[PDB]
């Protein structure tokens, strides 16, 4: 009995901690990926000038 009761109590604490961490991990990923997309939108894009010499490959 006491080993079983103890195993049930310890099991529930670790199971609780497992889920509270997953909530956090997914909440961070959605935040960071969305912000990096906003930053990506506002970076300076490329420049073109029709210069062939500049794009030579030897």
């Amino acid at each position: 009995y006491t080993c079983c009761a103890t195993s049930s109590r310890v099991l529930a604490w670790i199971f609780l901690v497992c889920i509270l961490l997953i909530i956090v991990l997914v909440s961070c990923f959605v935040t960071i990926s969305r912000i990096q997309w906003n930053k990506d939108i506002q970076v300076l894009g490329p420049v073109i000038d029709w210069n062939v010499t500049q794009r030579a490959v030897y």
């Binding site: 062939v52 010499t53 030579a56 030897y58």
Partner: peptide, 11 residues
């Protein structure tokens, strides 16, 4: 201007 030397097979 750009002057280049393309290799070609010769067997």
């Amino acid at each position: 201007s750009l002057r280049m030397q393309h290799p070609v097979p010769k067997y």
